[PDB]
Amino acid sequence: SGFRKMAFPSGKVEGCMVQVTCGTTTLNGLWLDDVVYCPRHVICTSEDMLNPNYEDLLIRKSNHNFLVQAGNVQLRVIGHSMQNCVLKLKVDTANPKTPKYKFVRIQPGQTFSVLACYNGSPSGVYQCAMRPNFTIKGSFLNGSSGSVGFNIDYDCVSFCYMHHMELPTGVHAGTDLEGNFYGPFVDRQTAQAAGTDTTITVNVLAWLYAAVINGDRWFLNRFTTTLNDFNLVAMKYNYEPLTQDHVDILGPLSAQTGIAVLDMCASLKELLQNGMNGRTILGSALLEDEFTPFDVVRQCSGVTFQ
Amino acid sequence: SGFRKMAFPSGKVEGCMVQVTCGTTTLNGLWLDDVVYCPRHVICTSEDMLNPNYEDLLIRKSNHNFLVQAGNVQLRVIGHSMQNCVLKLKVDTANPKTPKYKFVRIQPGQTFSVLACYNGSPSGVYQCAMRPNFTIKGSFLNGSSGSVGFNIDYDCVSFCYMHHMELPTGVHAGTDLEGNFYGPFVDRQTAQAAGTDTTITVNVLAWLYAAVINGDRWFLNRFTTTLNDFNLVAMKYNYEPLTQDHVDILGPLSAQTGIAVLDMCASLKELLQNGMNGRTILGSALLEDEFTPFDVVRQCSGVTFQ
């Protein structure tokens, strides 16, 4: 019993983290095989970040201007290149701790673990969702750029996120490991609009199923609804529209609990219209949307990793 | 910016986890140097757990009745003994991945990370507090016994918890690494009273300071109070009494924010009497008590570990 915001075991990713320095800017890099991946703003000063021309700045840099340290040992940089917003530093040693890995670009609403790093070293790990507006609500301080987000499937690490930016609103933005930002953001110190942040409806439903499995179910009501009727409510509360793909993904949890997806939707509708009346669900006083349906099944069934 | 329930990087502890089997019961063990630590109820059947006589059950067991597997390799057991509620299996190989470590017995209200394990393998990691009533509100399924809780200080792992039991109320109980239960609990399947669960007042205050540092401060009021007056309120809301030791521990956060500890107490009093009126603090709709003052300072300043 119990239900917690659980992050993946971080050991496989810890062995990939290095420190990258260029001039007087230091941040984190990801060392996999003989390549180190890091944010290209490692070549910027504070002044450059107001309006950087990355191509022009990079041409001023040679391989020997990039210092890469893995623990106490210095890696020899033998080539460098820019891919979108990341730099790839070719080094002369393959990382002996490289795990099986993939690079993936996730969908909004999907979750991952972040290993927050400073100076190449881990500070902590936590589970995050990619918001519908492609930000994350992280915990990141100066120097945390190049920290990565990931999922694990048995022995394979899927890297999905590299941290780059804190927006003036205090939320966070970054790229996949090919260097393409999630959302409209750019690696420039300027004001950047993140649109309306909506709630990840299919995740809230999964978490309601988790609560039922754990025995919390005061919120189960006598009502049902339709997709179109539910979505009328979802629009008014800035919830993402629910689709039949989402209903399908929730099928296993519906089967386990005997609660039809549209019945749970009607319970969620009543929670949205009536609030919680001072009650809690799985220890929360609001509706939690950072568990996916796959996350609930993993945690309720004890899936392990190498 | 941002503030998250961050757990320690789990790599150092992952390399210590093994699987222990005795008869038809399997659970997790902790392999450090040439000793494997695990819950002594590894020698019980489901039937035995209703009323076990551990001394009599153990005498029936020899070294070769304990199977210890570390990944795909089998460890040779060369001695065994019971210390309180844990077994210590001496093995013929020292763990080559043993980290610098200590065994510590923590105080109620202190926090730690749990690496939830099944069959010797990690399923996930999360940050927990030891409740004032010596339970933890974990996420644990059958087979998770022997999962451990820990803190890290640079390169040294302080193991403070080994999981043993789920109470009929669904909360969790376990021991330090010397095998002594936290709280009054016993490793028997029977009804066990955990007393009143109170809120960890000094942790709520630390989290309020974290919120102020991150810019959330609608809750700061015009009032102040005294220790005795505040504690009158704390009693009525089942909060732990605040002491001058606690005020002292909060001093660095008071200094950083310019908010006297007793002023923050008066703000907390108003929150307790008036509620949140539908508002949130650091993304929570209730008062969060699983950050210690040391936790807030670590996260706000980016302390890293080896």
Side-chain angles (χ1 to χ4, degrees), chain A residues 1-2 4 7 9-11 14 122-125 127 137-141 166 172 290 299 302-303 305, chain B residues 1-2 4 7 9-11 14 122-125 127 137-141 166 172 290 299 302-305:
Chain A
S1 282
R4 276 282 181 177
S10 60
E14 290 171 50
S123 148
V125 65
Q127 192 69 2
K137 294 180 172 200
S139 178
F140 293 113
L141 300 172
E166 185 168 79
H172 301 115
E290 300 192 314
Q299 180 169 170
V303 173
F305 313 94
Chain B
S1 282
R4 276 282 181 177
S10 60
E14 290 171 50
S123 148
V125 65
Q127 192 69 2
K137 294 180 172 200
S139 178
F140 293 113
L141 300 172
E166 185 168 79
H172 301 115
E290 300 192 314
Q299 180 169 170
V303 173
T304 60
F305 313 94

mmCIF file of all heavy atoms in Angstrom, chain A residues 1-2 4 7 9-11 14 122-125 127 137-141 166 172 290 299 302-303 305, chain B residues 1-2 4 7 9-11 14 122-125 127 137-141 166 172 290 299 302-305:
data_model
loop_
_atom_site.group_PDB
_atom_site.id
_atom_site.type_symbol
_atom_site.label_atom_id
_atom_site.label_comp_id
_atom_site.label_asym_id
_atom_site.label_seq_id
_atom_site.Cartn_x
_atom_site.Cartn_y
_atom_site.Cartn_z
ATOM 1 N N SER A 1 0.787 -1.242 0.000
ATOM 2 C CA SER A 1 0.000 0.000 0.000
ATOM 3 C C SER A 1 0.814 1.283 0.000
ATOM 4 O O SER A 1 2.035 1.247 0.214
ATOM 5 C CB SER A 1 -0.887 0.061 1.223
ATOM 6 O OG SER A 1 -2.022 -0.768 1.038
ATOM 7 N N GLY A 2 0.089 2.411 -0.161
ATOM 8 C CA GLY A 2 0.701 3.720 -0.307
ATOM 9 C C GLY A 2 1.003 4.043 -1.755
ATOM 10 O O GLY A 2 1.196 3.173 -2.592
ATOM 11 N N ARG A 4 3.415 7.073 -3.969
ATOM 12 C CA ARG A 4 4.421 8.116 -3.814
ATOM 13 C C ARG A 4 4.874 8.606 -5.172
ATOM 14 O O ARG A 4 4.904 7.866 -6.145
ATOM 15 C CB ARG A 4 5.620 7.540 -3.088
ATOM 16 C CG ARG A 4 5.544 7.519 -1.573
ATOM 17 C CD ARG A 4 5.842 8.958 -1.015
ATOM 18 N NE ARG A 4 5.803 8.954 0.445
ATOM 19 C CZ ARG A 4 6.068 10.018 1.184
ATOM 20 N NH1 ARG A 4 6.496 11.141 0.625
ATOM 21 N NH2 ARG A 4 5.932 9.941 2.514
ATOM 22 N N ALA A 7 10.752 8.363 -8.313
ATOM 23 C CA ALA A 7 11.627 8.608 -9.425
ATOM 24 C C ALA A 7 12.397 7.328 -9.737
ATOM 25 O O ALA A 7 12.482 6.424 -8.918
ATOM 26 C CB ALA A 7 12.601 9.744 -9.127
ATOM 27 N N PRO A 9 15.605 4.876 -10.300
ATOM 28 C CA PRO A 9 16.944 4.728 -9.697
ATOM 29 C C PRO A 9 17.921 5.428 -10.611
ATOM 30 O O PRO A 9 17.853 5.237 -11.835
ATOM 31 C CB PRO A 9 17.180 3.197 -9.682
ATOM 32 C CG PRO A 9 15.763 2.601 -9.895
ATOM 33 C CD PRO A 9 14.988 3.584 -10.675
ATOM 34 N N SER A 10 18.774 6.278 -10.019
ATOM 35 C CA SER A 10 19.588 7.215 -10.800
ATOM 36 C C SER A 10 20.998 6.718 -11.116
ATOM 37 O O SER A 10 21.689 7.421 -11.829
ATOM 38 C CB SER A 10 19.706 8.597 -10.122
ATOM 39 O OG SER A 10 20.306 8.555 -8.812
ATOM 40 N N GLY A 11 21.404 5.498 -10.669
ATOM 41 C CA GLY A 11 22.801 5.069 -10.792
ATOM 42 C C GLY A 11 23.352 5.072 -12.211
ATOM 43 O O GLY A 11 24.493 5.543 -12.462
ATOM 44 N N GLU A 14 23.997 8.624 -13.177
ATOM 45 C CA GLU A 14 25.099 9.262 -12.435
ATOM 46 C C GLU A 14 26.435 9.005 -13.103
ATOM 47 O O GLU A 14 27.277 9.910 -13.185
ATOM 48 C CB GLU A 14 25.169 8.741 -10.988
ATOM 49 C CG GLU A 14 23.981 9.220 -10.088
ATOM 50 C CD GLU A 14 23.960 8.514 -8.741
ATOM 51 O OE1 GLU A 14 25.003 8.455 -8.062
ATOM 52 O OE2 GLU A 14 22.861 7.978 -8.402
ATOM 53 N N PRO A 122 25.914 15.061 -8.856
ATOM 54 C CA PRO A 122 24.467 14.977 -8.599
ATOM 55 C C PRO A 122 24.057 15.653 -7.299
ATOM 56 O O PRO A 122 24.708 15.499 -6.255
ATOM 57 C CB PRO A 122 24.245 13.464 -8.476
ATOM 58 C CG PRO A 122 25.326 12.865 -9.303
ATOM 59 C CD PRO A 122 26.538 13.728 -8.933
ATOM 60 N N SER A 123 22.928 16.360 -7.330
ATOM 61 C CA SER A 123 22.454 16.921 -6.099
ATOM 62 C C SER A 123 21.197 16.200 -5.629
ATOM 63 O O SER A 123 20.961 16.098 -4.415
ATOM 64 C CB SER A 123 22.235 18.437 -6.268
ATOM 65 O OG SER A 123 21.179 18.908 -5.462
ATOM 66 N N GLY A 124 20.456 15.592 -6.557
ATOM 67 C CA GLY A 124 19.210 14.931 -6.173
ATOM 68 C C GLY A 124 18.409 14.502 -7.382
ATOM 69 O O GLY A 124 18.701 14.863 -8.535
ATOM 70 N N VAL A 125 17.381 13.712 -7.111
ATOM 71 C CA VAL A 125 16.571 13.187 -8.195
ATOM 72 C C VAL A 125 15.059 13.361 -7.877
ATOM 73 O O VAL A 125 14.627 13.233 -6.725
ATOM 74 C CB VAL A 125 16.991 11.716 -8.472
ATOM 75 C CG1 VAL A 125 16.673 10.859 -7.281
ATOM 76 C CG2 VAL A 125 16.267 11.154 -9.704
ATOM 77 N N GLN A 127 10.789 13.198 -9.856
ATOM 78 C CA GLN A 127 9.919 12.890 -10.973
ATOM 79 C C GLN A 127 9.163 14.153 -11.352
ATOM 80 O O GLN A 127 8.666 14.842 -10.455
ATOM 81 C CB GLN A 127 8.951 11.773 -10.527
ATOM 82 C CG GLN A 127 8.146 11.081 -11.533
ATOM 83 C CD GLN A 127 8.863 10.193 -12.491
ATOM 84 O OE1 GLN A 127 10.094 9.983 -12.468
ATOM 85 N NE2 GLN A 127 8.072 9.594 -13.325
ATOM 86 N N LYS A 137 8.098 22.173 -14.271
ATOM 87 C CA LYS A 137 8.087 22.882 -12.992
ATOM 88 C C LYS A 137 9.136 22.175 -12.156
ATOM 89 O O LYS A 137 8.883 21.227 -11.394
ATOM 90 C CB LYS A 137 6.666 22.860 -12.390
ATOM 91 C CG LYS A 137 5.702 23.629 -13.203
ATOM 92 C CD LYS A 137 4.291 23.570 -12.556
ATOM 93 C CE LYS A 137 3.339 24.485 -13.230
ATOM 94 N NZ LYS A 137 2.198 24.737 -12.271
ATOM 95 N N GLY A 138 10.388 22.576 -12.388
ATOM 96 C CA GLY A 138 11.504 21.874 -11.817
ATOM 97 C C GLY A 138 12.002 22.555 -10.561
ATOM 98 O O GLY A 138 11.400 23.484 -10.012
ATOM 99 N N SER A 139 13.190 22.134 -10.162
ATOM 100 C CA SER A 139 13.905 22.738 -9.047
ATOM 101 C C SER A 139 15.326 22.881 -9.562
ATOM 102 O O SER A 139 16.092 21.891 -9.607
ATOM 103 C CB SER A 139 13.848 21.883 -7.805
ATOM 104 O OG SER A 139 14.613 22.548 -6.790
ATOM 105 N N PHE A 140 15.669 24.084 -10.030
ATOM 106 C CA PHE A 140 16.931 24.273 -10.743
ATOM 107 C C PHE A 140 17.506 25.638 -10.351
ATOM 108 O O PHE A 140 16.763 26.614 -10.208
ATOM 109 C CB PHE A 140 16.810 24.261 -12.282
ATOM 110 C CG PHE A 140 16.423 22.960 -12.881
ATOM 111 C CD1 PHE A 140 15.206 22.816 -13.505
ATOM 112 C CD2 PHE A 140 17.303 21.917 -12.860
ATOM 113 C CE1 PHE A 140 14.831 21.639 -14.116
ATOM 114 C CE2 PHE A 140 16.967 20.702 -13.531
ATOM 115 C CZ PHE A 140 15.741 20.578 -14.157
ATOM 116 N N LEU A 141 18.793 25.660 -10.088
ATOM 117 C CA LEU A 141 19.523 26.861 -9.671
ATOM 118 C C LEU A 141 20.536 27.166 -10.757
ATOM 119 O O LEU A 141 20.750 26.347 -11.640
ATOM 120 C CB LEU A 141 20.262 26.603 -8.354
ATOM 121 C CG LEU A 141 19.463 26.216 -7.107
ATOM 122 C CD1 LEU A 141 20.420 25.832 -5.995
ATOM 123 C CD2 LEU A 141 18.525 27.389 -6.640
ATOM 124 N N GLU A 166 15.824 28.926 -17.245
ATOM 125 C CA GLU A 166 14.729 29.320 -16.375
ATOM 126 C C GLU A 166 14.058 30.571 -16.961
ATOM 127 O O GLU A 166 14.720 31.586 -17.206
ATOM 128 C CB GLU A 166 15.258 29.592 -14.974
ATOM 129 C CG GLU A 166 14.105 29.896 -13.980
ATOM 130 C CD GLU A 166 14.631 29.879 -12.577
ATOM 131 O OE1 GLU A 166 15.239 30.892 -12.214
ATOM 132 O OE2 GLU A 166 14.619 28.824 -11.900
ATOM 133 N N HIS A 172 10.657 26.140 -16.168
ATOM 134 C CA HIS A 172 11.891 25.723 -16.814
ATOM 135 C C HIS A 172 11.665 25.198 -18.235
ATOM 136 O O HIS A 172 10.592 24.707 -18.577
ATOM 137 C CB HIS A 172 12.542 24.706 -15.944
ATOM 138 C CG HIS A 172 12.851 25.229 -14.580
ATOM 139 N ND1 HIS A 172 12.252 24.729 -13.450
ATOM 140 C CD2 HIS A 172 13.696 26.224 -14.168
ATOM 141 C CE1 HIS A 172 12.705 25.403 -12.397
ATOM 142 N NE2 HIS A 172 13.600 26.293 -12.804
ATOM 143 N N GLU A 290 0.751 14.458 -12.304
ATOM 144 C CA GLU A 290 2.088 14.008 -12.729
ATOM 145 C C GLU A 290 2.332 12.517 -12.574
ATOM 146 O O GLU A 290 3.497 12.093 -12.478
ATOM 147 C CB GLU A 290 3.189 14.776 -12.010
ATOM 148 C CG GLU A 290 3.198 16.209 -12.202
ATOM 149 C CD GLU A 290 4.560 16.745 -11.637
ATOM 150 O OE1 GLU A 290 5.034 16.379 -10.506
ATOM 151 O OE2 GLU A 290 5.204 17.513 -12.363
ATOM 152 N N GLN A 299 3.932 1.303 -10.491
ATOM 153 C CA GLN A 299 4.100 1.416 -9.051
ATOM 154 C C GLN A 299 3.198 0.448 -8.325
ATOM 155 O O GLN A 299 3.642 -0.169 -7.357
ATOM 156 C CB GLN A 299 3.862 2.837 -8.583
ATOM 157 C CG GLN A 299 4.031 2.985 -7.060
ATOM 158 C CD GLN A 299 4.053 4.467 -6.566
ATOM 159 O OE1 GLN A 299 3.988 4.711 -5.363
ATOM 160 N NE2 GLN A 299 4.122 5.435 -7.490
ATOM 161 N N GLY A 302 5.012 -3.089 -8.830
ATOM 162 C CA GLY A 302 6.417 -3.248 -8.447
ATOM 163 C C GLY A 302 7.383 -3.619 -9.560
ATOM 164 O O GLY A 302 8.245 -4.493 -9.362
ATOM 165 N N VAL A 303 7.291 -2.948 -10.717
ATOM 166 C CA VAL A 303 8.245 -3.195 -11.801
ATOM 167 C C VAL A 303 9.645 -2.763 -11.357
ATOM 168 O O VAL A 303 9.824 -1.667 -10.818
ATOM 169 C CB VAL A 303 7.783 -2.458 -13.077
ATOM 170 C CG1 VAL A 303 8.809 -2.539 -14.165
ATOM 171 C CG2 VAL A 303 6.360 -3.010 -13.563
ATOM 172 N N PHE A 305 14.058 -2.503 -12.262
ATOM 173 C CA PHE A 305 15.036 -2.252 -13.321
ATOM 174 C C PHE A 305 16.390 -2.877 -12.962
ATOM 175 O O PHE A 305 16.672 -3.176 -11.801
ATOM 176 C CB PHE A 305 15.172 -0.732 -13.574
ATOM 177 C CG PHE A 305 13.867 -0.064 -13.681
ATOM 178 C CD1 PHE A 305 13.279 0.523 -12.569
ATOM 179 C CD2 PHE A 305 13.173 -0.102 -14.866
ATOM 180 C CE1 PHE A 305 12.004 1.061 -12.663
ATOM 181 C CE2 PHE A 305 11.922 0.442 -14.985
ATOM 182 C CZ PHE A 305 11.330 1.034 -13.886
ATOM 183 N N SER B 1 15.174 28.610 -9.323
ATOM 184 C CA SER B 1 13.835 28.582 -8.717
ATOM 185 C C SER B 1 13.136 27.233 -8.750
ATOM 186 O O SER B 1 13.594 26.310 -9.442
ATOM 187 C CB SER B 1 12.917 29.552 -9.425
ATOM 188 O OG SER B 1 13.186 30.874 -8.993
ATOM 189 N N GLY B 2 11.982 27.179 -8.053
ATOM 190 C CA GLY B 2 11.236 25.946 -7.868
ATOM 191 C C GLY B 2 11.688 25.192 -6.636
ATOM 192 O O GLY B 2 12.815 25.309 -6.175
ATOM 193 N N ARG B 4 11.142 21.097 -4.953
ATOM 194 C CA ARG B 4 10.657 19.757 -5.257
ATOM 195 C C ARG B 4 10.999 18.812 -4.126
ATOM 196 O O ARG B 4 12.008 18.959 -3.449
ATOM 197 C CB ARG B 4 11.334 19.261 -6.518
ATOM 198 C CG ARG B 4 10.706 19.685 -7.832
ATOM 199 C CD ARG B 4 9.438 18.799 -8.114
ATOM 200 N NE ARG B 4 8.833 19.171 -9.390
ATOM 201 C CZ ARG B 4 7.781 18.556 -9.905
ATOM 202 N NH1 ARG B 4 7.277 17.476 -9.324
ATOM 203 N NH2 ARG B 4 7.248 19.016 -11.044
ATOM 204 N N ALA B 7 14.945 13.445 -3.786
ATOM 205 C CA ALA B 7 15.565 12.347 -3.100
ATOM 206 C C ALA B 7 17.055 12.337 -3.432
ATOM 207 O O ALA B 7 17.492 12.942 -4.401
ATOM 208 C CB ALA B 7 14.933 11.016 -3.496
ATOM 209 N N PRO B 9 20.624 10.919 -4.802
ATOM 210 C CA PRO B 9 21.063 10.051 -5.912
ATOM 211 C C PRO B 9 21.277 8.672 -5.337
ATOM 212 O O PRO B 9 21.899 8.546 -4.271
ATOM 213 C CB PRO B 9 22.399 10.685 -6.375
ATOM 214 C CG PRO B 9 22.372 12.105 -5.751
ATOM 215 C CD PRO B 9 21.564 12.026 -4.519
ATOM 216 N N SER B 10 20.707 7.660 -6.010
ATOM 217 C CA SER B 10 20.606 6.316 -5.433
ATOM 218 C C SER B 10 21.730 5.366 -5.839
ATOM 219 O O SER B 10 21.740 4.262 -5.326
ATOM 220 C CB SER B 10 19.259 5.636 -5.760
ATOM 221 O OG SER B 10 19.015 5.475 -7.172
ATOM 222 N N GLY B 11 22.710 5.795 -6.681
ATOM 223 C CA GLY B 11 23.696 4.862 -7.238
ATOM 224 C C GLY B 11 24.501 4.085 -6.205
ATOM 225 O O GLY B 11 24.702 2.849 -6.336
ATOM 226 N N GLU B 14 22.281 1.432 -4.791
ATOM 227 C CA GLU B 14 21.927 0.368 -5.745
ATOM 228 C C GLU B 14 22.969 -0.734 -5.755
ATOM 229 O O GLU B 14 22.623 -1.921 -5.815
ATOM 230 C CB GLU B 14 21.794 0.925 -7.175
ATOM 231 C CG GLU B 14 20.539 1.840 -7.378
ATOM 232 C CD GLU B 14 20.558 2.548 -8.725
ATOM 233 O OE1 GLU B 14 20.770 1.891 -9.761
ATOM 234 O OE2 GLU B 14 20.393 3.806 -8.702
ATOM 235 N N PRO B 122 16.114 -2.578 -7.899
ATOM 236 C CA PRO B 122 15.470 -1.299 -7.560
ATOM 237 C C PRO B 122 14.222 -1.029 -8.388
ATOM 238 O O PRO B 122 14.198 -1.233 -9.610
ATOM 239 C CB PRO B 122 16.554 -0.278 -7.929
ATOM 240 C CG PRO B 122 17.831 -1.025 -7.774
ATOM 241 C CD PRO B 122 17.490 -2.386 -8.392
ATOM 242 N N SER B 123 13.185 -0.499 -7.739
ATOM 243 C CA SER B 123 12.032 -0.131 -8.506
ATOM 244 C C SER B 123 11.897 1.386 -8.578
ATOM 245 O O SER B 123 11.388 1.912 -9.580
ATOM 246 C CB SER B 123 10.778 -0.805 -7.916
ATOM 247 O OG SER B 123 9.623 -0.014 -8.093
ATOM 248 N N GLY B 124 12.455 2.098 -7.598
ATOM 249 C CA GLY B 124 12.310 3.552 -7.586
ATOM 250 C C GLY B 124 12.811 4.153 -6.292
ATOM 251 O O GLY B 124 13.108 3.456 -5.306
ATOM 252 N N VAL B 125 12.909 5.475 -6.298
ATOM 253 C CA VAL B 125 13.433 6.162 -5.132
ATOM 254 C C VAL B 125 12.526 7.369 -4.760
ATOM 255 O O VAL B 125 11.982 8.055 -5.634
ATOM 256 C CB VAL B 125 14.916 6.547 -5.397
ATOM 257 C CG1 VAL B 125 14.995 7.540 -6.520
ATOM 258 C CG2 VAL B 125 15.567 7.151 -4.145
ATOM 259 N N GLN B 127 11.663 10.464 -1.318
ATOM 260 C CA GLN B 127 11.999 11.077 -0.048
ATOM 261 C C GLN B 127 10.809 10.925 0.886
ATOM 262 O O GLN B 127 9.677 11.166 0.452
ATOM 263 C CB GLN B 127 12.317 12.565 -0.309
ATOM 264 C CG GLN B 127 12.947 13.356 0.747
ATOM 265 C CD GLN B 127 14.358 13.030 1.098
ATOM 266 O OE1 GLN B 127 15.037 12.149 0.531
ATOM 267 N NE2 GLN B 127 14.849 13.800 2.018
ATOM 268 N N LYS B 137 5.036 6.810 5.754
ATOM 269 C CA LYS B 137 3.938 6.734 4.792
ATOM 270 C C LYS B 137 4.614 6.456 3.464
ATOM 271 O O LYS B 137 4.968 7.347 2.673
ATOM 272 C CB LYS B 137 3.113 8.038 4.830
ATOM 273 C CG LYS B 137 2.413 8.220 6.117
ATOM 274 C CD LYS B 137 1.604 9.547 6.104
ATOM 275 C CE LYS B 137 0.733 9.671 7.296
ATOM 276 N NZ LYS B 137 -0.340 10.684 6.969
ATOM 277 N N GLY B 138 4.909 5.172 3.254
ATOM 278 C CA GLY B 138 5.718 4.774 2.135
ATOM 279 C C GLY B 138 4.866 4.296 0.980
ATOM 280 O O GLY B 138 3.636 4.412 0.953
ATOM 281 N N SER B 139 5.546 3.650 0.048
ATOM 282 C CA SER B 139 4.905 3.003 -1.088
ATOM 283 C C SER B 139 5.597 1.654 -1.176
ATOM 284 O O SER B 139 6.741 1.553 -1.675
ATOM 285 C CB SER B 139 5.072 3.796 -2.362
ATOM 286 O OG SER B 139 4.443 3.052 -3.416
ATOM 287 N N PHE B 140 4.954 0.622 -0.622
ATOM 288 C CA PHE B 140 5.621 -0.668 -0.459
ATOM 289 C C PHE B 140 4.597 -1.777 -0.723
ATOM 290 O O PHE B 140 3.434 -1.665 -0.323
ATOM 291 C CB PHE B 140 6.203 -0.920 0.948
ATOM 292 C CG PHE B 140 7.339 -0.046 1.334
ATOM 293 C CD1 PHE B 140 7.197 0.874 2.345
ATOM 294 C CD2 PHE B 140 8.548 -0.196 0.717
ATOM 295 C CE1 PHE B 140 8.241 1.668 2.766
ATOM 296 C CE2 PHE B 140 9.664 0.574 1.166
ATOM 297 C CZ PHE B 140 9.501 1.490 2.188
ATOM 298 N N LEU B 141 5.014 -2.772 -1.472
ATOM 299 C CA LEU B 141 4.178 -3.913 -1.858
ATOM 300 C C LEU B 141 4.797 -5.150 -1.238
ATOM 301 O O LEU B 141 5.910 -5.088 -0.734
ATOM 302 C CB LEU B 141 4.165 -4.069 -3.383
ATOM 303 C CG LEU B 141 3.638 -2.925 -4.252
ATOM 304 C CD1 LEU B 141 3.902 -3.238 -5.712
ATOM 305 C CD2 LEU B 141 2.101 -2.685 -4.013
ATOM 306 N N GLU B 166 4.013 -3.771 6.817
ATOM 307 C CA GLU B 166 2.881 -2.893 6.582
ATOM 308 C C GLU B 166 1.820 -3.156 7.661
ATOM 309 O O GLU B 166 1.375 -4.294 7.845
ATOM 310 C CB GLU B 166 2.315 -3.144 5.191
ATOM 311 C CG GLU B 166 1.180 -2.142 4.850
ATOM 312 C CD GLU B 166 0.847 -2.235 3.392
ATOM 313 O OE1 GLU B 166 0.134 -3.188 3.059
ATOM 314 O OE2 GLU B 166 1.423 -1.502 2.554
ATOM 315 N N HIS B 172 3.662 2.166 7.313
ATOM 316 C CA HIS B 172 4.782 1.239 7.288
ATOM 317 C C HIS B 172 5.689 1.375 8.515
ATOM 318 O O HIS B 172 5.774 2.430 9.139
ATOM 319 C CB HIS B 172 5.529 1.458 6.019
ATOM 320 C CG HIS B 172 4.682 1.241 4.809
ATOM 321 N ND1 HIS B 172 4.377 2.258 3.936
ATOM 322 C CD2 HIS B 172 4.064 0.117 4.332
ATOM 323 C CE1 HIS B 172 3.595 1.772 2.977
ATOM 324 N NE2 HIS B 172 3.415 0.474 3.181
ATOM 325 N N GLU B 290 7.404 17.367 5.206
ATOM 326 C CA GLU B 290 8.505 16.425 4.937
ATOM 327 C C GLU B 290 9.755 17.063 4.356
ATOM 328 O O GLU B 290 10.550 16.367 3.700
ATOM 329 C CB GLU B 290 8.054 15.286 4.032
ATOM 330 C CG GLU B 290 6.973 14.466 4.530
ATOM 331 C CD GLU B 290 6.883 13.203 3.602
ATOM 332 O OE1 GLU B 290 6.921 13.276 2.325
ATOM 333 O OE2 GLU B 290 6.824 12.101 4.161
ATOM 334 N N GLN B 299 18.685 22.265 -0.730
ATOM 335 C CA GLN B 299 18.080 22.401 -2.045
ATOM 336 C C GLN B 299 18.192 23.820 -2.545
ATOM 337 O O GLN B 299 18.487 24.015 -3.725
ATOM 338 C CB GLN B 299 16.637 21.939 -2.034
ATOM 339 C CG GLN B 299 15.971 22.075 -3.415
ATOM 340 C CD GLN B 299 14.578 21.377 -3.519
ATOM 341 O OE1 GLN B 299 13.864 21.577 -4.500
ATOM 342 N NE2 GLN B 299 14.196 20.587 -2.505
ATOM 343 N N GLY B 302 22.030 24.129 -3.653
ATOM 344 C CA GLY B 302 22.596 23.163 -4.598
ATOM 345 C C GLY B 302 23.754 22.321 -4.090
ATOM 346 O O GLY B 302 24.747 22.136 -4.817
ATOM 347 N N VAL B 303 23.641 21.768 -2.874
ATOM 348 C CA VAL B 303 24.682 20.876 -2.360
ATOM 349 C C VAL B 303 24.741 19.610 -3.220
ATOM 350 O O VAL B 303 23.709 19.001 -3.515
ATOM 351 C CB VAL B 303 24.406 20.559 -0.874
ATOM 352 C CG1 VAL B 303 25.345 19.519 -0.345
ATOM 353 C CG2 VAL B 303 24.452 21.898 0.006
ATOM 354 N N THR B 304 25.948 19.200 -3.619
ATOM 355 C CA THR B 304 26.099 17.989 -4.412
ATOM 356 C C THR B 304 26.773 16.902 -3.587
ATOM 357 O O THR B 304 27.269 17.156 -2.477
ATOM 358 C CB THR B 304 26.870 18.253 -5.696
ATOM 359 O OG1 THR B 304 28.175 18.762 -5.350
ATOM 360 C CG2 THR B 304 26.081 19.230 -6.562
ATOM 361 N N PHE B 305 26.755 15.681 -4.146
ATOM 362 C CA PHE B 305 27.392 14.507 -3.549
ATOM 363 C C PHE B 305 28.324 13.827 -4.559
ATOM 364 O O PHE B 305 28.215 14.027 -5.769
ATOM 365 C CB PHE B 305 26.318 13.522 -3.028
ATOM 366 C CG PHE B 305 25.270 14.199 -2.250
ATOM 367 C CD1 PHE B 305 24.095 14.618 -2.860
ATOM 368 C CD2 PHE B 305 25.489 14.508 -0.929
ATOM 369 C CE1 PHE B 305 23.161 15.342 -2.136
ATOM 370 C CE2 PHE B 305 24.569 15.204 -0.191
ATOM 371 C CZ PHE B 305 23.394 15.620 -0.787
#
